[PDB]
């Protein structure tokens, strides 16, 4: 015979065979390589997901929802549930009336955030060919309990890895989407200044006469706080 | 009046999902996705490692050259997937 | 259906400037960005810049980083690539393919691909 | 960068053969980038293979593509007429930047 070095292995199992592409092979059947963690069955060959006790590993991909309640909310404790151009936005009640536009900047930048965080998961394949068994028909003993002790404790520990990176990640996410808010609110408060204050809720309270255009302004970032200076008579 | 108001809001969903942070349990977001796959399609796809399928035989079955596994004699594989359907038609034979 | 027009053919003496324009139709402008790459006469393709519609964010390429200004125009889904201090290296046929999902989470690789491609416009430069 | 080395640079193969073509990575990268691109000469290039295997909308199913980390490559079987042209691979950085590859020549028939 031949007996050649190689990566060819043996499988037990009573699937059919049928006629698809697939790089990863269970003995249930083929699996997707796609997500990173698996719960099917241990056996695996080829390009095939980590497996890990765990049914269902929830990766945020976006930010906390939070519901809403004349008047208009920020921040603060509150969510805009219409606001669906963008994840973050202004609203505004001027002398013309309330109107709604969105922050497309800073809504990319915490979406690429996202994305790179799931590029880092998703995309990554693990490739193991040849390997133990860990179905064994009769009692043999020795041989038997120290293989079986490897892949428990592999199984084990590559659970409580995943369930780190899982909590790790969308706790990261979640103070990442808030900050990027955060941060709007104070790049608006440095750009009014003393035109301004904030009103408790997210709501900058602003004491100036603003047609749309001043909205306008603020939001693309000319509002000039000497051309509206005079009306500092906020004050008195 | 000349005092106008400017607020700040985020966006929301009105179907959550919920996830786990490090600290709270239960905590609720908008889009989430499954990092887990937990199901198979219930076929053994062909391409793109080559799979023997067993039939009758297991390998060392057709390497002894037990006459219903002729049709495996000087075969390449990847995969040679055994089934549990397994039977010898020949000299009972024990293998250390 | 999704479709990119480029702009037209162009003669440029050298140490001149030109202008190039890409126009999207049928998909939605902004979520898209708008990504340039250029093949010289007997040469592979070779990557420019890339435009995003929802930002206005650009990336330029090392080689043309000081010479190259790339702009967009929501009204009407119009990309424009300025290329200033041509040089005879630049002659070269320009495509404008589509680019990264700007709007939203990605998980399939299909916008993390150039799709959509325009038809190119050729741009000879010498005196 | 991120160069990357497509071999072999042409290759002649006669009507109805499976063909391999090879894109190498400087470094290891993952499979949700590195796209394979198809140019016929005086047309606009097109895209085949998105991702690592995807297949593009409209592309036949006799082109597949497969591999990881260094090594990509793209198949090609019951190679007709409509085929024949050069082939491009590219890949991605996280801030937007795309290198392409030198350009496989699949000049065939004898």
């Known amino acids: 015979f031949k007996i050649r070095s190689g990566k060819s292995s043996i499988m037990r199992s009573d699937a059919p065979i049928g006629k698809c592409n697939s790089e990863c092979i269970t003995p249930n059947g083929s699996i997707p390589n796609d997500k990173p963690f698996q719960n099917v069955n241990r056996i695996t060959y080829g390009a095939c997901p980590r497996y890990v006790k765990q049914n269902t590993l929830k990766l945020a991909t976006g930010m906390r929802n939070v519901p809403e309640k004349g008047a208009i909310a920020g921040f603060i404790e509150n969510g805009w549930e219409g606001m669906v151009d963008g994840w973050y936005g202004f609203r505004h009640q001027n002398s013309e009336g309330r109107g709604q536009a969105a922050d497309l900047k800073s809504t990319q930048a915490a979406i690429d955030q996202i994305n790179g965080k799931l590029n880092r998961l998703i995309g990554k394949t693990n490739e193991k060919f040849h390997q133990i068994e860990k179905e064994f028909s009769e009692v043999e003993g020795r041989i038997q309990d120290l293989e079986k002790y490897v892949e428990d404790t592999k199984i084990d520990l590559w659970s409580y890895n995943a369930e780190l990176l899982v909590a790790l990640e969308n706790q990261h996410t979640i103070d990442l989407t808030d900050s990027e808010m955060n941060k709007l609110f104070e790049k608006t408060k440095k750009q009014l200044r003393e035109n301004a204050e904030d009103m408790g809720n997210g709501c900058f309270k602003i004491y100036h006469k603003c047609d749309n255009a001043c909205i306008g302004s603020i939001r693309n970032g000319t509002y000039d706080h000497d051309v509206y200076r005079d009306e500092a008579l906020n004050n008195r | 009046n000349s005092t106008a108001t400017l607020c700040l809001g985020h966006h929301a969903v009105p179907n959550g999902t919920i996830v786990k942070t490090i600290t709270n349990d239960q905590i609720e977001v908008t889009n989430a996705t499954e990092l887990v796959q937990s199901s198979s399609t219930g076929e053994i796809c062909d391409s793109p490692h080559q799979i023997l399928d067993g039939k009758n035989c297991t390998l060392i079955d057709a390497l002894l050259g037990d006459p219903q596994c002729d049709g495996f004699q000087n075969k390449k594989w990847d995969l040679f997937v055994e089934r549990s359907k397994a039977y010898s038609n020949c000299y009972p034979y024990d293998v250390p | 259906q999704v479709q990119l027009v480029q702009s037209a053919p162009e003669v440029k003496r050298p140490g001149a400037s030109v202008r190039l324009s890409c126009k999207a139709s049928g998909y939605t402008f902004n979520t898209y960005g708008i990504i340039w790459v250029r093949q010289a006469p007997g040469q592979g393709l070779e990557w420019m810049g890339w435009i995003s519609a929802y930002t206005g964010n650009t990336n330029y390429a090392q080689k043309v980083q000081g010479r190259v200004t790339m702009t967009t125009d929501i009204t009407t889904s119009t990309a424009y690539l300025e290329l200033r201090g041509l040089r005879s290296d630049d002659t070269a046929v320009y495509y404008c393919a589509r680019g990264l999902l700007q709007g939203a989470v990605i998980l399939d690789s299909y916008h993390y691909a150039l799709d959509f491609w325009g038809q190119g416009t050729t741009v000879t430069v010498s005196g | 960068e991120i160069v990357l080395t497509q071999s072999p640079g042409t290759l002649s193969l006669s009507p109805g053969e499976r063909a391999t073509l090879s894109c190498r990575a400087s470094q290891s990268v993952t499979n949700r980038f590195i796209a394979w691109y198809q140019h016929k000469p005086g047309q606009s290039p097109r895209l085949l293979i998105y991702?690592?295997?995807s297949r593009a909308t409209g592309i036949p199913d006799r082109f597949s593509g497969r591999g990881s980390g260094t090594d990509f490559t793209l198949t090609i079987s019951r190679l007709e007429p409509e085929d024949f042209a050069v082939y491009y691979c590219?890949?991605?950085?996280?801030?937007?930047?795309?290198?392409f590859g030198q350009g496989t020549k699949l000049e065939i028939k004898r």
């Open positions: 991702g690592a295997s």
């Open positions: 590219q890949q991605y950085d996280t801030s937007p930047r795309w290198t």
